[PDB]
Amino acid sequence: MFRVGILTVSDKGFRGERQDTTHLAIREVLAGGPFEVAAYELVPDEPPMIKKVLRLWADREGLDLILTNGGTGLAPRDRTPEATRELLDREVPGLAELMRLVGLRKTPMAALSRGVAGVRGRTLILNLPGSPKGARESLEAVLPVLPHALSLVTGKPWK
Amino acid sequence: MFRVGILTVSDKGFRGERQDTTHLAIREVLAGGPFEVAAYELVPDEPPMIKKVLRLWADREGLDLILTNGGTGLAPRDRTPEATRELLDREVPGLAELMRLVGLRKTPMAALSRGVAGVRGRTLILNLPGSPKGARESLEAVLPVLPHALSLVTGKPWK
Amino acid sequence: MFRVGILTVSDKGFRGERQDTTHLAIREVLAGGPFEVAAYELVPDEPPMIKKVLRLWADREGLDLILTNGGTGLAPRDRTPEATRELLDREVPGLAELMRLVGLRKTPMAALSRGVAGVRGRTLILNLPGSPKGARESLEAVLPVLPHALSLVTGKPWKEG
Structure with missing residues (x-):
């Protein structure tokens, strides 16, 4: 299947002001499908740190x-x-x-x-919104075409 | 309350061929909302004149x-x-x-x-279409999220 | 009435004989409307060549x-x-x-x-998808506003009905 990375970007979350419950909603959406969460990271709203993880x-x-x-x-x-x-x-x-x-x-x-x-x-x-509700609805919106899109980009099967 | 500027871009309106009725539709859509139109301008389809007002x-x-x-x-x-x-x-x-x-x-x-x-x-x-119907309908589409968007952009609080 | 050109982009169009069914699907959608297909060409997946035809x-x-x-x-x-x-x-x-x-x-x-x-x-x-079904559905989606769009871009008139 496809290996996924979940990157939470949040000043408040990174500095410990609030907890990240959004990744939890994302994991639920991915569970059951052809996905495997391979990595998770939390960074503040800073381009330099966001890119490092992306690269x-x-x-x-x-x-x-x-x-x-x-x-x-x-x-x-x-x-x-x-x-x-x-x-x-x-x-x-x-x-x-x-x-x-x-x-x-x-x-x-x-x-x-x-x-x-x-x-x-x-x-x-994909850049999902930061709220639990937002990220969920946005991810569910792309889920139907996600596997096929990934097959075309990666060249790997899922079904 | 958010201060609003309405800029009508129209060669005909600017030439004085036919008056601008679009700003009227815009004002009506905003009526009852946390909005106050503080400025109105009319310019032709000339980039320099449009940019001048926007700046x-x-x-x-x-x-x-x-x-x-x-x-x-x-x-x-x-x-x-x-x-x-x-x-x-x-x-x-x-x-x-x-x-x-x-x-x-x-x-x-x-x-x-x-x-x-x-x-x-x-x-x-926001660049709205030019007719009263056009501007009205496009503005109505964004109205529901407009106050929230402005609070984030301006930093000004909104209940 | 607007002059239309249909450009089928692929490398597969230069290799084992086959009828371009997407081209046909597109003509069908336009049939009846203020459209006249004045050009049709096949071009490989080479940007330089696609641009030459479009140019x-x-x-x-x-x-x-x-x-x-x-x-x-x-x-x-x-x-x-x-x-x-x-x-x-x-x-x-x-x-x-x-x-x-x-x-x-x-x-x-x-x-x-x-x-x-x-x-x-x-x-x-407009870049339509490559399959007959895909090109058809995408073109039908724009069809209702296509004549109006063309009149503004080209400055040419069209009849309704």
Whole structure:
């Protein structure tokens, strides 16, 4: 199956101001599917630290999928999208749109996420919103096409 | 309460051929909300004139929200998106998507709006389509998340 | 009435005889509308070559609409979007979203297309997926606003009905 890395980006969480329960929601969404959580890391809202982990998991570990959560809001410090985009060879806008739950009749707060989606080498990277609820709904939105997308990027089977 | 600037981009309106009724629709959508229109300007489809007002409102007048309308279409003269995007520190694609009313069973003409959304300093800027109908419907789409987005961008609290 | 060019992007189009069924699917969607297919060509998955055709069709031939199909997937060889973007004066993201069938809960996989949409000179260019089914669904999604879009880009009129 596909090896996943979960990167939580949060100033408050990194400095111990609050606990990360978002990775727990993400794990639940992945459980049952063709996924294996190979790594987990918590970093503050700092591009330098976000990238190090992204490069590490993509270039050294060769993870198939990287799911970051947090740092995609409109707050000045939220810079996960910018950090991620700097490392992508190409983007997959369709996945970014899915994560924003585009199409719902009731305007979703998910629309405020600036998260991007793209490929670095043979690793798919998705920026999920930071809240437990947000990350969950956004991940569930892409789940239906995630396996096939990963097969195309990595070249590995799942079904 | 958030201070709003309405910038109408229209060759005809600027020429004085037909008056601007779009700002009226915008004001009505915002009515009853934590909004106060503090500035109104009318310019033609000229990038320099558009940029001039956007810079004045964001950099010196300190407005919280700038709502431009017009010049986002596919006509050769429609250059509001370009003129605006070049002044943004970062974009909020999710709001641009909401303004295109993405997801309606019947393909919307709003899909033909190239308007962008983003932040410059502590000012949120959205490019709405130019007609009263166009601006009205696109603004209604983003209204539900507008106060929250502004609180994050401006730092000003909102209940 | 708008002059349309259909460009089928692939290397498989230069190798064992086969009928281009995607090309046919596209013609069917346009049938009846203010469209006349004035050009059709096959091109390999070589960006330089894709650009040469797009360049000529827009700059020299003056086509109103260019519908490319294929090479929009997540595979390292699918570079139709990159090749296209490099030739556009401006993009029309709304059309790219329509081609991905966003929010229609019609065909989930359509969301993986990286096809772009934009204008070069007075030519509207859209990158449709490569399969007959994919190209068909993406084109039908934009069809309702395609004539209006072309009238603005080209400055040419069209009849309704």
